[PDB]
Ligand SMILES: CCS(=O)(=O)c1ccc(CNC(=O)N2CC3(CCCC3)c3nc(-c4c(OC)ncnc4C4CC4)ccc32)cc1
């Protein structure tokens with residue numbers, strides 16, 4: 464590579480993110496004052512466990528859809544073979560959402576954006592997975608302290624997804640080359656903006672893997688309680704990425720084909 468080529472990659476990644484960020488940061492901050500009432504928290508707590516799981520599975524899917532769109536728009540992703548594209552999204556799309564989540568987290572009152580308003584851990588008690596919720600919250604709290612810029616998230620999420628270590632990749636060297644360019648792009652931006660300090664403060668890759676495995680773990684617990692609910696009321700893309708053996712229907716495949 465060259466210095467010019469690397470700077471072009473920074474802007475290409477940032478553009479790709481701006482176009483696929485789901486909600487604009489400005490729209491998220493303006494809403495921080497809009498918080499659920501005590502009666503509205505009771506309302507969420509009074510809802511059934513299956514209803515809460517269904518609503519949560521639907522929002523995770525919508526967030527994943529934008530992460531798929533980000534991958535398609537990512538420099539060098541569509542050039543990779545179909546197998547590697549799918550391995551990279553199956554293993555990383557969930558992790559990209561988990562990072563993007565801190566944008567909708569307010570560390571001041573310990574609230575997250577959910578269905579038009581801001582709520583705390585209490586709003587998700589009906590789910591019956593208080594450990595996963597607390598984990599998502601602490602992880603969001605941790606990244607909030609870093610005070611990420613939209614460009615920084617754009618470049619970091621690009622690397623999260625483009626990982627050569629992912630098990631099952633056919634063209635490892637091709638991903639190793641893509642990762643190396645994105646590494647440089649990210650490090651160049653951080654160097655230019657005097658933000659090299661956050662590198663040590665970044666969460667270890669093992670923590671992202673832990674939260675993903677924790678989701679699947681609590682999902683199978685819920686699946687054993689309401690199998691017909693996962694079968695009839697859960698999104699097809701969610702089922703493929705997390706439910707076993709819901710991997711039968713290939714939704715990601717069609718998502719990548721068109722455009
Ligand atoms: C993402 C791009 S963005 O533009 O910044 C953006 C856009 C929309 C929203 C709305 N909220 C939302 O989607 N929410 C809220 C919360 C956070 C914590 C509690 C509930 C949650 N959680 C999950 C989630 C999981 O998030 C990664 N991981 C595992 N399980 C779950 C489900 C609770 C079972 C999945 C969506 C989800 C927020 C942010």
Ligand code: NA
Pocket residue numbers: 565566567568569570606607
């Ligand atoms: Na934040």
